Design an enzyme around this catalytic site. Structure first.
Site, PDB file in Angstrom:
ATOM      1  N   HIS A  81       0.753  -1.150   0.147  1.00  0.00           N
ATOM      2  CA  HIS A  81      -0.128  -0.204  -0.070  1.00  0.00           C
ATOM      3  C   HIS A  81       0.626   1.383  -0.028  1.00  0.00           C
ATOM      4  O   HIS A  81       0.943   2.056  -0.856  1.00  0.00           O
ATOM      5  CB  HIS A  81      -0.884   0.158   1.340  1.00  0.00           C
ATOM      6  CG  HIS A  81      -1.724   1.399   1.286  1.00  0.00           C
ATOM      7  ND1 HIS A  81      -2.947   1.319   0.613  1.00  0.00           N
ATOM      8  CD2 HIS A  81      -1.506   2.329   2.159  1.00  0.00           C
ATOM      9  CE1 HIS A  81      -3.560   2.714   0.872  1.00  0.00           C
ATOM     10  NE2 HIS A  81      -2.684   3.275   1.738  1.00  0.00           N
ATOM     11  N   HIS A 118      -9.554  -0.017   5.356  1.00  0.00           N
ATOM     12  CA  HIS A 118      -9.901  -0.819   4.116  1.00  0.00           C
ATOM     13  C   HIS A 118     -10.812  -2.160   4.540  1.00  0.00           C
ATOM     14  O   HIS A 118     -10.816  -3.154   3.834  1.00  0.00           O
ATOM     15  CB  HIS A 118      -8.512  -1.230   3.681  1.00  0.00           C
ATOM     16  CG  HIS A 118      -7.609  -0.252   3.217  1.00  0.00           C
ATOM     17  ND1 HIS A 118      -6.568   0.366   4.185  1.00  0.00           N
ATOM     18  CD2 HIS A 118      -7.459   0.503   1.936  1.00  0.00           C
ATOM     19  CE1 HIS A 118      -5.990   1.327   3.365  1.00  0.00           C
ATOM     20  NE2 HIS A 118      -6.339   1.330   2.161  1.00  0.00           N
ATOM     21  N   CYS A 180       2.323 -18.924   4.849  1.00  0.00           N
ATOM     22  CA  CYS A 180       1.491 -19.940   5.702  1.00  0.00           C
ATOM     23  C   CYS A 180       0.822 -21.070   5.022  1.00  0.00           C
ATOM     24  O   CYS A 180       1.490 -21.643   4.354  1.00  0.00           O
ATOM     25  CB  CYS A 180       0.338 -19.071   6.643  1.00  0.00           C
ATOM     26  SG  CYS A 180      -0.222 -19.909   8.172  1.00  0.00           S
TER      27      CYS A 180
END
Lengths: 276, 276
Positions: A81, A118, A180
């Site tokens: 971002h 967001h 992950c």
């Protein structure tokens, strides 16, 4: 305390134990190298494919109260971002993103506001099939981000839509980011046409969530192990343990755990900053 | 205390007095109706044309330490952001945006993080002439935002580039947003071709900054009054005083002061949310 914790919202569901919650989460994150003076001014946005289900079934019938991991979702997105790249969330169903709030860094002066600003994007996600149907060589995405969290283990690994999405990106030389259990989503290509074959990647070790339940991180064992399945799908999983390291393999950037979220973010920003 | 305050960084420059600083600024903003569940997922971004100069010359040779007003810049952008619209900053020169930090709401748990997360965009702005040269019926902007602050009084009112930019927007049915002294930028059309003629707007009253110096807001009087000049350029300025109200006139949304920043933000989001 290594005892799983009741999740009154579901029949026989459990959150991670107090011992593991303090073992793998923190009220504050490792968000760190957010140094980006020359930000991207393009129009390409990251496409985030998230989980719409919170409960994962274990070996003993108990439901595991999981979902998308906040740190693995927000740290990378935070760097990307601040680097000028915007993100657009999508879910297989269109239902809201399901987060593992027990791993949300409440009390983090940067990550929480980012999140709050967001949140709508995760709450009112887009349906991945809609996104897929409009995908063409010009689709303005630049990268597909599949965040971690056991939630990624449900739905995504059998999605004809996540498959198309991925094939579209590698075909159109776009980046693919994950960490992950997120790569478990790459399993959606096991049934023919796998442009993700000989790619090396680092993910969560099967041996890890093989033992985590021994401390109550999960109310039981997994019904299967995505790690070995990726091995059979022709992908190379670098790490055999949890190390918090991240790897780059020609547009494929990945990490093995909440521990690699910050580094995966820097690696992502810095690499795409260069591509764009 | 109504005495102007030395700005050691410049020869004979002054910040607003302690009396006025507490009269017109606050450690916390009025950011309020940030309720947007169905955010815009398009690609159009707001184009922010900001000031690259901090010092404005007054009637007595003293320089006024001004620039862009944070509240008038960040509140609107905050609502528009949470509504799915991204913004891209530009400066006539390309030099960094100059803010009136003395009016920055330090200690605001939402506005500061928002700021911190998009600071680079103001620091490394784009040169408006570059943006203009690429402007075509397809330019993905949706709206041009000219924030307030006496800084807008310098440069912008004589910019062939801000002119083109504005003509492009009204020609291509785009929105145009502004407040405080920002409309002073519309003066860049006074020399022929003013698609902003019979438009009504509410801005800062000439009579206001006619008296503000009487309390030290400014080290002296303005060299001219943009308000009456807009009147001669054929624009209708609704308000004659400072009321904090905002007005809509077919894609032209405006406000008269830091007091209208929040409302101008809601009006902007809600109106474009509908257009897009």
């Amino acid at each position: 305390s290594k005892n799983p914790q009741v999740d009154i919202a579901e029949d026989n569901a459990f959150f991670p134990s107090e011992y593991s919650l303090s073992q793998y989460t923190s009220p504050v994150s490792d968000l760190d190298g957010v140094d980006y003076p020359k930000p991207y001014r393009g129009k390409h946005k990251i496409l985030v494919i998230a989980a719409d289900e919170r409960y994962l079934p274990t070996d003993n019938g108990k439901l595991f109260s999981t979902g998308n991991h906040p740190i693995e979702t927000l740290l990378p997105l935070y760097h990307l971002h601040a680097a000028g790249f915007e993100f657009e969330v999508a879910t297989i169903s269109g239902l809201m993103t399901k987060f593992e709030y027990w791993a949300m860094p409440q009390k983090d002066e940067k990550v929480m506001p980012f999140f709050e600003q967001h949140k709508s994007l995760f709450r009112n996600p887009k349906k991945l099939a809609d996104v897929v149907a409009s995908l063409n060589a010009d689709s303005e995405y630049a990268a597909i981000f599949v965040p971690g969290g056991h939630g990624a283990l449900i739905g995504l690994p059998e999605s004809q839509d996540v498959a198309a999405a991925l094939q579209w990106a590698i075909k159109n030389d776009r980046f693919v980011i994950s960490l992950c259990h997120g790569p478990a989503a790459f399993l959606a290509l096991r049934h023919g046409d796998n442009p993700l074959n000989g790619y090396s990647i680092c993910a969560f070790p099967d041996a890890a969530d093989k033992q985590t339940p021994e401390i109550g991180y999960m109310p039981g064992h997994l019904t299967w192990y995505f790690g070995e399945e990726l091995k059979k799908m022709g992908m190379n999983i670098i790490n055999d343990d949890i190390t918090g390291r991240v790897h780059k393999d020609r547009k494929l950037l990945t990490g093995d755990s909440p521990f690699a979220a910050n580094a995966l973010g820097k690696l992502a920003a810095q690499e795409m900053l260069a591509a764009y």
